[PDB]
Every structure is written in structure tokens, then in C-alpha cells.
Ligand SMILES: *[C@@H]1O[C@H](CO)[C@@H](O)[C@H](O)[C@H]1NC(C)=O
Ligand SMILES: *[C@@H]1O[C@H](CO)[C@@H](O)[C@H](O)[C@H]1NC(C)=O
Ligand SMILES: *[C@@H]1O[C@H](CO)[C@@H](O)[C@H](O)[C@H]1NC(C)=O
Ligand SMILES: *[C@@H]1O[C@H](CO)[C@@H](O)[C@H](O)[C@H]1NC(C)=O
């Protein structure tokens with residue numbers, strides 16, 4: 001997918017690898033190389049009014 | 051088994067009448083929704099966001115999202131017009147004079163407080179503090195809340211201008227120019243509008259002022275204690291949430307496909323067989339969004355009907371004195387004061403309620419010299435021995451003279467005629 | 476000016492226009508033409524290719540109908556409001572403020588228009604107002620006199636009684652005011668002499 | 673509401689023409705260009721209220737106001753054998 | 760039930776029937792199926 005990846009404060013568990021949301025979408029992930037809780041978030045979007 | 055009320059047996063006779071001997075100034079409250087939460091969905095991001103393959107396939111399903119966006123824009127414009135047609139009824143913002151002595155009536159609970167940074171009345175503070183993440187977990191999937199045009203400060207200024215015009219001028223600032231008038235005379239006019247004479251107010255001004263102040267003070271306690279008073283507005287805040295969160299829950303449904311994630315379908319299967327798996331999700335999500343829009347249409351229609359009712363009440367109860375029963379309060383409507391609230395308006399109806407009734411002997415007419423004397427404005431009562439004439443809303447016994455009754459024919463065809471002498475000055 | 480009548484002509488037209496635009500869409504099929512699908516494919520697959528189009532067109536027509544229902548409900552509400560105004564503003568003189576025109580309602584005239592009614596509300600707006608010194612009541616010989624129908628005003632030196640909508644100064648006499656109690660409990664009492672014809 | 677680029681924010685408040693949101697409203701004013709500003713609710717009037725003063729009108733005017741109200745729409749009918757299945 | 764000469768027997772509830780309805784309400788309920 002696409003989005004912004006930032007450092008998250010979600011206290012994941014050693015066996016937990018992903019993280020869902022209300023709409024069954026992945027909010028946070030774990031980098032397989034270095035153990036770190038990321039945060040998947042799309043960039044800015046909205047409506048263009050002329 | 052639920053009770054339908056108490057049991058009252060009003061004694062009905064051909065000769066007795068109940069005349070009220072005192073009165074009460076009751077301030078009731080009425081809550082009316084005006085606007086909703088303007089929401090705007092996204093065409094592609096809700097159906098399939100962060101996916102370039104589905105963005106190309108969604109274009110072959112007609113211009114459904116365009117119609118949905120048009121309907122949402124229409125709903126937003128309608129909710130803005132609903133707020134503009136209720137509070138913005140005057141073209142001149144009035145101001146309260148520095149001296150706040152209006153005869154004895156204390157309006158400190160409804161006038162705006164300049165010390166507070168919100169510039170709202172103490173009642174509006176409780177109204178806004180009792181009507182209350184999910185505002186960021188829904189934005190990332192198209193659900194966007196548009197801010198209203200008229201902010202809370204502008205609605206507060208509109209309500210303050212309406213209150214100033216009602217206190218200083220009365221009902222003259224709604225018809226034409228604002229005509230200044232002392233508040234005791236305005237209250238005397240309000241009393242004359244329902245039948246009570248001006249002397250009843252001018253001789254009991256302190257009692258009426260004390261009753262009005264006590265009712266205004268008890269209104270704050272009633273609104274602060276009971277949490278279900280501001281419910282009709284909270285429902286508008288609740289259902290809208292149920293209209294959004296559920297619309298989010300529809301993104302976790304597979305609609306007969308293998309999964310609810312389009313990335314997992316595009317990565318595993320090839321497009322030739324992923325088309326049929328993506329079409330079910332697209333159709334299901336489009337149908338869910340269409341259902342959301344067609345329900346929000348009915349909700350906006352109901353809210354527009356409520357806003358029209360609130361505007362009619364603002365025009366008939368605040369800008370004047372309506373004689374419609376149970377429209378501007380329960381009883382003899384005296385006046386009304388508007389206040390703002392989150393997506394709603396609160397009308398404080400000041401009403402005249404009779405009390406402490408007493409039983410007297412009545413008669414249709416009297417004749418002194420063989421000619422029936424009918425009351426010009428009032429009713430004939432008796433105290434057991436003498437006959438007096440009093441109005442239909444307050445016991446004020448007066449002698450029967452020639453200027454209080456008119457002659458019409460002889461007293462031979464009327465039923466219930468009693469002989470009594472009249473006075474001639 | 477005639478915009479409210481134009482909108483119901485525009486949206487309705489749009490309600491048809493989009494209803495046609497849903498006929499050129501595939502709804503997930505191979506095309507939007509029936510004969511092309513029946514000629515390029517086999518009857519076994521023709522059903523699975525045409526049922527999607529049938530369902531899409533059925534859903535479009537159902538959406539059109541369920542939107543026209545709400546539109547007809549709004550039009551029915553507006554027509555009920557117009558009928559109430561015709562019965563109250565034209566057939567009589569209603570005292571409802573901001574219902575039969577901005578100001579003191581005098582009369583109303585109905586006019587027809589394409590799918591609509593235009594009410595010309597003839598009203599009464601005061602103007603050229605001026606200030607006066609008012610008083611709740613007056614007492615001549617120890618008995619308060621309250622105005623029967625009007626208001627006591629003053630021009631600086633004399634006191635008159637005028638109606639509440641037009642400045643018509645009249646001499647305060649015994650037939651313009653009524654006596655009710657003494658002038659001891661009223662706030663703002665001013666002494667002034669009354670006339671008796 | 674968001675980020676508005678293309679119009680300058682003037683401090684004086686005029687009558688709102690093109691509503692934007694949250695009190696901000698745009699218009700095309702005077703070289704002429706598009707400006708944005710906080711909409712004005714009306715004129716700041718102050719009634720000289722007093723215990724003894726009353727405003728009595730001395731004349732009047734008869735004015736005719738116009739109110740447009742829709743009554744009906746265009747009756748539309750559709751058929752199944754032609755809209756969905758063309759011949 | 761002497762109200763001056765007006766007979767409200769057709770609108771007041773009749774205690775004879777067990778339904779405790781007025782003579783007009785009987786026809787109102789017997790015409791809506
Ligand atoms: C009038 O009312 C009284 C009390 O109900 C009743 O006794 C009397 O009969 C009534 N009038 C006549 C003359 O019927
Ligand atoms: C009227 O009511 C008030 C408040 O209940 C009371 O103080 C006053 O004495 C009453 N006056 C009469 C006429 O009984
Ligand atoms: C009005 O009420 C306020 C409290 O909100 C009080 O401080 C003030 O003294 C009162 N004024 C009068 C006229 O009694
Ligand atoms: C009038 O008489 C009736 C008789 O039933 C009584 O119930 C009622 O309280 C009386 N009203 C007063 C307070 O005079």
C-alpha cells in the first residue's frame with residue numbers, strides 16, 4: 001500500500017506482528033529486519049473547492 | 051397498567067363560576083433541533099483507498115459517487131439554510147444599554163456575559179457543556195465533517211440581538227423599526243393581549259418581577275439537574291455517529307468475496323480472476339454508501355421540518371405575542387426568549403398561569419327597569435348578597451354602572467335572568 | 476427571484492438525466508449494449524453477462540423512485556404551507572408575525588406561476604418615529620387613571636393619549652381612561668389633571 | 673475549513689457573497705480581485721432604552737412583499753419493458 | 760347532563776356498551792377494517 005510511516009508508541013507484544021482497526025485495516029506494522037513498531041497512515045487529502 | 055393522570059370532577063352548574071384570584075409567571079423550556087453535522091464522503095478512497103488498480107475499475111460503474119457528492123452538498127446547503135432562517139431574522143444587531151434596570155426583572159441569566167471569553171449567557175454555557183478516537187479513524191476512509199458556516203459566536207450574537215430587541219422594543223423590531231418602550235409598559239401590553247388589564251400588573255409589579263426572577267433561577271437548576279432535558283439534540287449527535295461508525299463497519303465485510311482487503315486480492319490472484327472478486331466488494335460498498343445517503347436524506351428532511359417549526363416559533367413567540375394555545379408555552383403566552391445550543395435552539399417561554407380560583411354565583415344578564423343589561427367586557431359574579439362585574443382572568447369586583455354594561459331588549463327571552471339594580475353616574 | 480420554482484425544475488431534470496447516464500454504464504459487464512453481448516457470447520454466458528446489467532438498471536430505477544418519493548414529500552410539505560397561507564393570508568387577516576409578510580399584515584393577493592404560487596403580501600410598516608415622555612398612569616384627585624386603549628405620552632409640557640401605532644394626540648378625558656385604585660403602589664406615577672365633559 | 677489560496681484576508685467586514693465556511697466568506701471586490709473576510713451580521717444598532725422614553729411612529733408606509741412557494745412537480749412515469757430491455 | 764339545551768349524547772361516552780365509546784366512535788370503528 002501507500003502511506004506515511006512514523007514511529008508509534010503502541011506497546012506491541014513479542015508474538016504480535018500486525019495491528020488492525022475498526023474497518024479491519026492495518027494501522028501499525030513491525031519491521032521484520034529491526035524490531036520497531038511503525039504507524040501506517042495515508043498522507044494529506046481532502047476536497048478542492050473552486 | 052399505566053395511569054392516564056389523576057381524576058378531577060369539575061362541578062358543573064348553571065349558576066356557579068370559578069374566577070381566579072391570583073397568578074403565576076411560569077418559565078418553561080422547549081428544545082428544537084436546527085441543523086446537523088455536515089458530512090462529505092470520498093468517491094474512491096472509501097470504496098478502495100490506497101489502490102491504483104481499483105481506482106481504474108471503479109470508473110466503469112457509472113457516476114454514482116458524483117450523485118452522492120451532489121446529494122451531500124445539497125444536504126449541507128440545506129442545513130446551512132436551516133440555521134440562517136432561524137437565527138438570522140433581523141437585519142440590525144441590537145445592543146443592551148449599560149443600565150440594566152428594566153423595572154425589576156433580572157435578565158442576567160439570559161444576557162451575554164462580557165467577562166467570559168465565549169460571550170454567552172450562563173444558560174448557554176450549560177446548554178453547550180451538556181451536549182457532547184472516532185474523528186480520525188473515519189477521516190482516513192473518506193468520511194469528512196464540514197464545518198458550519200455560522201460559528202457559535204455568530205449565533206450567540208444573533209440571540210443577543212434578538213434578546214435586546216425583545217427587551218428594549220418588544221415586538222416593534224420585527225415588524226418595522228425598533229420602537230423603544232419601558233419594560234413595565236411592555237409587560238402591561240402583554241397582559242392586555244391575553245385579557246388582563248394594566249392595573250393588575252402596575253399594582254403587582256414587584257410580585258411579578260420576583261416570580262419571573264425565581265422562575266428564571268429555577269430554569270438553570272432544572273436544566274443542570276435533569277440530564278435528559280437536552281436529549282432531542284443529543285440524538286441528532288448520536289444517530290449521525292451511528293450513521294458513520296456503521297458505514298465504517300461495512301468496510302470489513304467481504305460481500306461474498308475471499309477477503310475485505312483489496313491488496314490481498316491483487317497480490318494473490320491475477321487481474322483476470324481478481325475482477326470478479328473486486329466487483330462484489332465495489333457493489334457492496336457502493337450499495338452501503340447509497341443506503342447511508344438515502345437515510346441521511348430522510349434525516350435531513352426531518353431536521354429541516356424541525357428547523358421550519360423553530361423558525362415559525364421564533365417569528366411568532368419571540369418577535370411577537372401569539373394567541374395560539376400550546377404553541378408558545380403551556381398557558382396564556384406572555385413572551386419568549388431564544389438561546390443557542392449545539393445544533394439546536396432553546397425557547398424559554400414566559401407564561402401567565404391563573405391560580406387560587408374561587409367560586410361565585412354568575413348570571414347571564416340583569417335588568418333594572420325592564421331592559422336586559424349585558425356585560426360589555428367582563429362577567430357578572432355574586433358574593434352571596436351583592437352583584438359585581440369582573441374580568442374573565444382576575445377577580446376585581448366593581449360596581450355595575452352604565453359604562454360597564456349595555457342594554458339590548460327586554461329580559462323576557464333570556465334564560466337565567468336575575469333582578470338587580472344598576473348604577474348611573 | 477423565481478429561483479425556488481426553477482430548482483424543482485432543475486433537480487427533477489437531473490433526476491432524469493442521471494437516470495439516462497446509468498444506461499451507458501457496464502455495471503461490471505463487458506459492455507452496455509444488449510445485442511452486442513447476445514451476438515458476441517453464448518446463451519449460457521449471456522445470462523451471467525446480462526443479469527448484472529439488469530440488476531444495475533433495477534437499482535438505478537429504485538434509487539430514482541426512492542429519491543422522487545422524498546422530493547414529492549418536500550413538495551407536499553411546501554404545498555401544505557402554501558395552502559395554509561392561502562387560507563390565512565388571502566381568505567382573512569392573520570396576526571401571525573412574519574407569516575403573511577414582513578410587518579403588520581394587511582392583505583394578500585395570490586398569483587399563479589409554473590408549478591408554484593406567488594403571494595403578494597400588502598403590509599403596514601411604521602416610519603418617521605419620534606420620542607416622547609411616557610408614564611404608566613396619572614391621578615387627578617387621588618385615584619389612578621390607566622389608559623383604556625392607548626398610551627400616555629408627553630411633548631415636554633402637556634400630556635396626551637395616543638394609539639400604539641400612530642401619533643394622534645388627544646386630550647386625556649374620562650372616556651379615554653379608567654380608574655383603578657389609588658396611585659400609591661404604581662411605580663412612575665406622575666400627577667396630571669384629567670378632563671370631564 | 674482548510675487552506676484558501678488565491679484570495680487575501682482583509683480586516684474590514686462586508687456583506688457575504690460567496691460563503692466558504694466557519695465565518696470566512698469570499699467576494700470579488702476592488703484593479704479588482706477576490707477577497708475573503710469575516711461576514712458581518714448587520715448594522716450595530718443601540719436602542720436608547722429608558723424608564724420614561726417611548727418611540728411613537730408618526731407616519732406609515734404600505735409595502736408589497738413577494739413570496740414564492742412551489743405547489744407541484746412534473747409527473748413522470750417509467751416502464752420496465754422498454755427502459756431495461758430495449759426491444 | 761343539562762348543559763343549557765345542547766345534547767352531547769352523541770359525543771359523550773355511553774356507559775351501556777362495554778367499550779365505553781360514544782355513538783360516533785362506534786361507527787368510526789365499524790367502518791375501518
Ligand atoms: C341548571 O343546573 C342545576 C345544577 O346542575 C340544575 O339543578 C338545574 O336543573 C339546571 N337548570 C334547569 C332549569 O334545568
Ligand atoms: C398571590 O400569590 C403570591 C405568591 O403566591 C402571594 O405572595 C400573594 O399573597 C398572593 N396574593 C393574593 C391575592 O392572595
Ligand atoms: C441578577 O442576578 C445576578 C446573578 O446572576 C445577581 O448577581 C444580580 O445582583 C441580580 N440583579 C438583580 C437586579 O437582582
Ligand atoms: C368550588 O366548588 C367545588 C365543589 O365541588 C370545589 O371542588 C372547588 O374546590 C370550589 N372552588 C373553590 C376553591 O372555591
Ligand SMILES: *[C@@H]1O[C@H](CO)[C@@H](O)[C@H](O)[C@H]1NC(C)=O
Nearest residue numbers: 432433434435436437438447
Ligand atoms: C358582599 O360584598 C359586599 C360589598 O363588598 C359586602 O359589604 C358584603 O359583606 C359581602 N357579603 C359577603 C357574604 O361577603
Ligand SMILES: *[C@@H]1O[C@H](CO)[C@@H](O)[C@H](O)[C@H]1NC(C)=O
Nearest residue numbers: 417418420466467468469470
Ligand atoms: C323582577 O322584577 C319584576 C318587577 O318587580 C317582577 O315582576 C319579577 O317577578 C322579578 N323577577 C324576579 C327574578 O324576581
Ligand SMILES: *[C@@H]1O[C@H](CO)[C@@H](O)[C@H](O)[C@H]1NC(C)=O
Nearest residue numbers: 629630631632633634635644
Ligand atoms: C405641547 O402641546 C401643547 C398643545 O398642543 C402646545 O400648546 C405646546 O406648545 C406643546 N409644547 C411643546 C414644547 O411642543
Ligand SMILES: *[C@@H]1O[C@H](CO)[C@@H](O)[C@H](O)[C@H]1NC(C)=O
Nearest residue numbers: 614615617663664665666667
Ligand atoms: C402629586 O401630588 C401630591 C399631592 O399634591 C404630592 O404629594 C406629590 O408629591 C405629587 N407628585 C408629583 C409627581 O409631583
Ligand SMILES: *[C@@H]1O[C@H](CO)[C@@H](O)[C@H](O)[C@H]1NC(C)=O
Nearest residue numbers: 149151153721722723724725
Ligand atoms: C431608571 O430607573 C433606575 C432606578 O430608579 C435608575 O437607576 C436609572 O438611572 C433610571 N434610568 C433612566 C433615568 O432612564
Ligand SMILES: *[C@@H]1O[C@H](CO)[C@@H](O)[C@H](O)[C@H]1NC(C)=O
Nearest residue numbers: 602603642729730731732733
Ligand atoms: C407621510 O409620508 C408621506 C410620504 O413620504 C408624506 O407625503 C407625508 O407628508 C407624510 N406625513 C407626515 C405626517 O409626515
Ligand SMILES: *[C@@H]1O[C@H](CO)[C@@H](O)[C@H](O)[C@H]1NC(C)=O
Nearest residue numbers: 760761764765766767768769
Ligand atoms: C338527546 O338525544 C337523544 C337521542 O340522540 C334523545 O333520546 C334525548 O332525549 C335527548 N336529550 C335531550 C336533552 O333532549
